[PDB]
């Protein structure tokens, strides 16, 4: 049913959705469900009279995003004919039983529209819900926890919105909205200082980062002044190391720690004074989080 | 639009040629809607040329090499040549070089990231897959995916789990039956509705959900051609497939509803004979693998 209406875009757009990239997400999403005809099941089962009440609930606790997308969904394929009881809002916690949405719509498009409302949610809510276990590994200090473009196909915008509802900070969203010098820059380069350095001349408006695999290269982009330093993979001992030379030096420097992190290492990290931890398992290894959608009886 | 070719390979693997470039094409565009990349222009010379190996940090299995390579069939308009691949299926170990290619330097550190994302996303899925098979060896329990998929990848991912040693279940809403509890909910009872899918459309295979042992006898009555159980307890199952094999039937039974991997191993002891996992598409863990140059 060709696109939604400007009140889905403008509930969107107030959640810091991309409304844009969310409509491609979602109507390809529904392709993959019905390019293979009608369904089957529903059509047999249920008549096209029939209206219910739907109730998202959590099985599990954790983090809840991904609602404005879901009732996009709804919006699309009941075309605006649905209404809604009651919703919680991305960022809220849910603990187990409690109902993230009430709906009520035809029943045969509720039946279309589930899985496809379900997927979003979960993944979503699943990304919200571990980047919310590494920001509370975090309580204590002023560490905090930043994603990266090791996203899903697809999904890099909705993904990185989500890690914004768990309480962590986005990085780039692309290749040329920020510099980040790695290790494959700093070999053509020749040095780290170099590449640094050639990226400042070349686009001087951009944010700029550089990342570093031992203490001597870390010492060369201090002394050029570097605005921030990915330290990669650094054990805990190497981070204490590293905070204390960029204490000395005459810039403060950002620090991140990347690669080789674990939930359970976090605060071990966090405690050495870095300012920035960048996981990229917040993306690639979210588990989901299990929400179900149930018909009133 | 790529080399055709890479067409060929694709068709080869058995992955559907339009989907894959959708996702490819897609997955650039997120990486390039801001503008070229600042930091390889800034550093690398445009002449530069480079051998690159792709290798995983850990054990596994590879899938997604064919879709990886069309990554870089766009991005190089064809300007490339592998030395060494691997197939998907085949099991890696830490430091195995699953590819081994020569590219122009930019274009690799271009096609990079969107590769290893697909690459290690679908390995990822290929190696749980794998695991759930192994604690289903010694039995005929046989495991299966369902629409639990990432938005967008649906296809490559039951490609995935396919290369990791699963079956598929049914790709969408309308190329099989099954009718699920909200079904039973909007349309009275379990019997009731399994009657009517058959009536409808008499040549197609209903598959139901049940989440009661009553509800099973109640299909098991109907000669049920195919019966789903839904969060059913290990010990519930042995009584399922007990109540299966003293029926008259030859219904099967497949078990599903939260099911996890330190579980998987007991579940295909009770004589089901299908277990559908969600976790195989919606919670794959990724596997670690890099691109390294020469
Ligand atoms: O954008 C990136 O390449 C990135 C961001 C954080 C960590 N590692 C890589
Ligand atoms: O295709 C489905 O809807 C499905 C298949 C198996 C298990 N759960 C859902
Ligand atoms: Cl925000
Ligand atoms: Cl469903
Ligand atoms: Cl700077
Ligand atoms: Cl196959
Ligand atoms: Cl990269």
Same mark, same amino acid.
């Given at each position: 049913?060709?696109?939604?209406?400007?009140?889905?875009?403008?509930?969107?757009?107030?959640?810091?959705?991309?409304?844009?990239?969310?409509?491609?997400?979602?109507?390809?999403?529904?392709?993959?469900?019905?390019?293979?005809?009608?369904?089957?099941?529903?059509?047999?089962?249920?008549?096209?009279?029939? $209206?219910?009440?739907?109730?998202?609930?959590?099985?599990?606790?954790?983090?809840?995003?991904?609602?404005?997308?879901?009732?996009?969904?709804?919006?699309?394929?009941?075309?605006?004919?649905?209404?809604?009881?009651?919703?919680?809002?991305?960022?809220?916690?849910?603990?187990?039983?409690?109902?993230?949405?009430?709906?009520?719509?035809?029943?045969?498009?509720?039946?279309?529209?589930?899985?496809?409302?379900?997927?979003?949610?979960?993944?979503?809510?699943?990304?919200?819900?571990?980047? %919310?276990?590494?920001?509370? %590994?975090?309580?204590?200090?002023?560490?905090?926890?930043?994603?990266?473009?090791?996203?899903?196909?697809?999904?890099?915008?909705?993904?990185?919105?989500?890690?914004?509802?768990?309480?962590?900070?986005?990085? =780039?969203?692309?290749?040329?909205?920020?510099?980040?010098?790695?290790?494959?820059?700093?070999?053509?380069?020749?040095s780290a200082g170099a590449a640094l350095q050639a990226a400042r001349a070349?686009?001087?408006?951009?944010?700029?980062?550089?990342?570093?695999?031992?203490?001597?290269?870390?010492?060369?982009?201090?002394?050029?002044?570097?605005?921030? $330093?990915?330290?990669?993979?650094?054990?805990?001992?190497?981070?204490?190391?590293?905070?204390? =030379?960029?204490? %000395?030096?005459?810039?403060?420097?950002?620090?991140?720690?990347?690669?080789?992190?674990?939930?359970?290492?976090?605060?071990?990290?966090?405690?050495?004074?870095?300012?920035?931890?960048? $996981?990229?398992?917040?993306?690639?290894?979210?588990?989901?989080?299990?929400?179900?959608?149930?018909? %009133?009886?």
């Amino acid at each position: 049913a060709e696109a939604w209406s400007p009140a889905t875009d403008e509930r969107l757009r107030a959640a810091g959705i991309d409304a844009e990239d969310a409509r491609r997400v979602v109507v390809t999403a529904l392709e993959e469900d019905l390019r293979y005809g009608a369904d089957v099941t529903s059509d047999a089962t249920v008549p096209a009279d029939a $209206v219910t009440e739907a109730v998202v609930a959590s099985r599990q606790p954790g983090v809840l995003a991904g609602l404005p997308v879901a009732l996009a969904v709804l919006d699309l394929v009941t075309g605006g004919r649905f209404e809604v009881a009651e919703c919680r809002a991305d960022g809220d916690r849910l603990g187990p039983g409690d109902v993230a949405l009430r709906v009520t719509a035809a029943t045969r498009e509720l039946l279309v529209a589930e899985r496809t409302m379900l997927n979003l949610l979960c993944h979503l809510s699943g990304v919200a819900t571990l980047t %919310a276990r590494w920001n509370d %590994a975090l309580a204590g200090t002023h560490c905090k926890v930043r994603d990266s473009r090791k996203t899903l196909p697809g999904l890099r915008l909705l993904e990185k919105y989500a890690v914004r509802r768990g309480g962590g900070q986005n990085h =780039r969203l692309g290749l040329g909205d920020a510099i980040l010098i790695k290790d494959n820059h700093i070999v053509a380069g020749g040095s780290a200082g170099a590449a640094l350095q050639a990226a400042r001349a070349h686009t001087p408006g951009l944010p700029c980062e550089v990342e570093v695999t031992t203490l001597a290269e870390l010492d060369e982009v201090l002394a050029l002044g570097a605005d921030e $330093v990915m330290l990669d993979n650094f054990t805990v001992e190497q981070c204490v190391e590293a905070v204390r =030379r960029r204490d %000395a030096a005459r810039t403060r420097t950002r620090l991140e720690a990347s690669g080789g992190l674990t939930l359970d290492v976090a605060a071990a990290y966090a405690r050495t004074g870095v300012d920035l931890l960048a $996981v990229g398992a917040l993306t690639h290894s979210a588990p989901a989080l299990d929400l179900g959608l149930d018909f %009133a009886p």
